[PDB]
Amino acid sequence: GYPANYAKAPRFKALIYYTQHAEEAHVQFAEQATTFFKKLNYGDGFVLDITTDFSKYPYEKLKEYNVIIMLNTSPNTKAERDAFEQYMENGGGWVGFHAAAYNDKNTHWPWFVKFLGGGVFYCNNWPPQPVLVEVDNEEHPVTKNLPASFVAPASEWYQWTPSPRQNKDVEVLLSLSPKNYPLGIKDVVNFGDFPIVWSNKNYRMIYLNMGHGDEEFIDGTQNLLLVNAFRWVVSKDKSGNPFLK
Amino acid sequence: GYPANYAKAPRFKALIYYTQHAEEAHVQFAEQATTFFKKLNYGDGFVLDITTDFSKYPYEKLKEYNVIIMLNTSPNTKAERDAFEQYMENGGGWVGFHAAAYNDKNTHWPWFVKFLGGGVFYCNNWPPQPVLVEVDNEEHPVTKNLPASFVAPASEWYQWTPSPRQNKDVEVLLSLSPKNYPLGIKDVVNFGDFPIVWSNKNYRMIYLNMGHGDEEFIDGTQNLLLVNAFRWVVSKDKSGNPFLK
Amino acid sequence: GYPANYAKAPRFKALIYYTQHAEEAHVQFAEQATTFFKKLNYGDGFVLDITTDFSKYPYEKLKEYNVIIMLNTSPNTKAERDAFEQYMENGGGWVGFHAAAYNDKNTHWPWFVKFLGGGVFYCNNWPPQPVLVEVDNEEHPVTKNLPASFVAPASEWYQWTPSPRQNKDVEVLLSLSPKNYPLGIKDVVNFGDFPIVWSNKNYRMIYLNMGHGDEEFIDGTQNLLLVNAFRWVVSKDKSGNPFLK
Chain C residues in contact with A150 by the CB 8 A cut-off are: 147
- The DSSP H or E segment spanning C131 is strand C129-135
CB-closest option in A126, A179, A218 to C220: A218
Task: List B197's β-bridge partners, or say none.
Answer: B174, B208
CB contact (8 A) between residue C185 and residue B6: no
Please state, in angstroms and as integers, the Cα–Cα distance from residue A141 to each residue in A39, A225, B182, C28, following that order.
22, 10, 10, 42
Contact B26, B70 (CB under 8 A): no
Rounded to whole angstroms, how far apart are CA atoms C174 and C102? 18
Chain B: nearest CA to A232, how far in angstroms? Answer: 11
Residue A163: phi and psi, rounded to 5, are -60, 135
Between helix C24-40 and helix C220-235 the angle, nearest 10°, is: 70
Contacts of C243 (CB under 8 A, 6+ apart): A182, A184, A185, A188, C5, C11, C231, C234, C235
CB < 8 Å to A222, chain C = 220
Among the partner-chain residues A4, A7, A227, the one whose CB lies closest to the CB of B130 is A227
- What residues of chain A lie within 8 A of the CB of C7, using their CB? 126, 186-187
Distance CA B27, CA C164 (A): 46
Give yes or no for a contact between C147 and C135, defined as CB atoms under 8 angstroms apart: yes
Cα–Cα distances in Å, from C55 out to A89, C51, C77, C78?
68, 10, 8, 10
A–B interface: beta-carbon pairs under 8 A: 91
Phi, psi of C114 (to 5 degrees): -60, -50
- Answer yes or no: are the C-beta atoms of A208 and A96 closer than 8 Å: yes
Q: How many CB atoms lie within 10 A of CB C85?
A: 17
| Residue B80: Cβ within 10 Å count | 18
In a 13 Å sphere around the CA of A14, the CA atoms on its Cβ side amount to: 25
Using an 8 Å CB-CB cutoff, list chain B residues near C218. 218-220
Q: Bridge partners of A91?
A: none
Pairing of strands B195-200, B170-176: antiparallel
Read out DSSP for B102-138?
A: ---TT---HHHHHHHTSPEEEEE-BS-EEEEEEES-T
Tell me how far apart the alpha carbons of residues C217 and B121 are, in angstroms, rounded to a whole number: 37
- List the beta bridge partners of residue A13: A47
Subunits in contact with chain C (3 or more CB pairs closer than 8 Å) = A, B
C78: nearest Cα among C122, C37, C114, C108: C108
Cα C71 versus chain centre, distance: 7
d(C-alpha A38, C-alpha A44), whole Å = 9
Task: Give φ, ψ of C105 to 5 degrees.
Answer: -65, -20
For residue B7, the distance in angstroms to the closest alpha carbon of chain C comes to 6
Answer whether C177 sits within 8 Å of B145, measured CB to CB.
yes
Cα–Cα–Cα angle for A104, A107, A112, rounded to 5 degrees:
95
Are the beta carbons of B1 and B183 closer than 8 angstroms? no
In eight-state DSSP terms, residue B192 is S
Find out whether B93 and B65 touch, Cβ atoms under 8 Å: yes
Beta bridge pairs of residue B208: B97, B197
- Residue B3 to residue C177, Cβ atoms within 8 A: no
Question: Among C180, A86, A78, which residue's Cα sits nearest to residue B224?
Answer: C180
Minimal Cβ distance to B145: which of C180, C190, C192: C180
What are the Cα distances from residue B48, in Å, to B65, B126, C140, C214? Answer: 9, 34, 44, 22
In angstroms, the CA A199 to CA A160 distance is 15
**How far is Cα C118 from Cα A152, in angstroms, rounded to an integer?**
36
DSSP letter for B30, please.
H
Q: What angle do CA A137, A143, A149 make, to 5 degrees?
A: 75
Say how many Å lie between the first and final Cα of chain A, rounded.
17
CB C49 within 8 A of CB C102: no
**Strand extents, DSSP E, A30-76:** 47-51, 67-70
Contact between A203 and A169 (Cβ < 8 Å):
no
Q: What are the angstrom distances between the C-alpha of A29 and each of A35, A77, B45, C65?
A: 10, 23, 40, 34
Q: For residues B230 and B197, is the Cβ–Cβ distance under 8 A?
A: no
In sequence order, what are the residues at sequence separation of 6 or more whose Cβ sits closer than 8 angstroms to the Cβ of residue A168?
none
Q: Is the dihedral of CA C157, C158, C163, C167 positive or negative?
A: negative
- Angstrom CA distances, B212 to A204, B32, B132, B225, stand at 33, 10, 17, 16
**Alpha-carbon torsion (B88, B85, B29, A144), positive or negative:** negative
CA–chain centroid gap for C96, Å, is 3
Cα–Cα dist C162/C157, whole Å: 16
Closest to C137 (Cα-Cα) out of C194, C187, C197? C197
> Residues C141, C158: contact at Cβ < 8 Å?
no
Secondary-structure percent of chain C, ordered helix, strand, coil, rounded to 5: 30, 25, 45
| Alpha helical stretches, state H, C98-208 | 110-116
In chain B the domains, ranked by start, together with CATH numbers, are: 1-245 (3.40.50.880)
* Residues A125, A104: Cα–Cα separation, whole Å: 17
Using CB atoms within 10 Å of the CB of residue C90, give its burial: 0 to 12 exposed, 13 to 18 middle, 19+ buried: exposed
- Cα gap B85→C40, rounded to integer Å: 55
Pairing verdict, β C158-161 and C120-124: antiparallel
The residue among C170, C169, C189, C177 whose CA lies nearest residue C135 is C177
| Alpha carbons A140 and A126: distance in angstroms, whole number | 31
Q: How many residues are given for chain C?
A: 245
Comparing CA positions, the residue from B153, B169, B13 lying closest to residue B92 is B13
Residue C57's nearest CA partner among C34, C85, C29, C36 is: C85
Q: How far apart are CA B194 and CA B197, in angstroms?
A: 10
**CB proximity list for A80: less than 8 A, separation 6 or greater:** A54, A55, A57
C224: left (phi over 0), alpha (psi -120 to 50) or beta: alpha
Residue B8 makes CB contacts below 8 A (sequence gap 6+) with B245
Torsions phi, psi for A176 (to 5 deg):
-80, 120
Nearest by CB: A3 against B130, B185, B189 = B189
Helix (H, G, I), strand (E, B) or coil at C168: coil
Contacts of B154 (CB under 8 A, 6+ apart): A220, A223, B128, B129, B130, B212, B213, B215, B216
Chain mean position to CA B197: 8
Contact C223, C40 (CB under 8 A): no
Residue A75's closest CA among A91, A42, A52? A52
Residue type, A29: F
Interhelix angle A220-235/A24-40, nearest 10 degrees: 70
Q: Where do the H-state alpha helices sit in C53-118?
A: 59-62, 78-89, 110-116
| Dist CA C188 CA C184 (whole Å) | 4
Interface touch A128/C42, C-beta < 8 Å: yes
Residue A151, min C-alpha distance to chain C (Å): 5
Q: Across the interface, which of A132, A188, A218 has its CB nearest the CB of C5?
A: A188
Cβ neighbours of A174 (radius 10 Å): 27
What is the DSSP code (8-state) at residue A35? H
A93 SS3 class: strand
Give which of B224, B215, B106 is closest to B174, Cα–Cα: B224
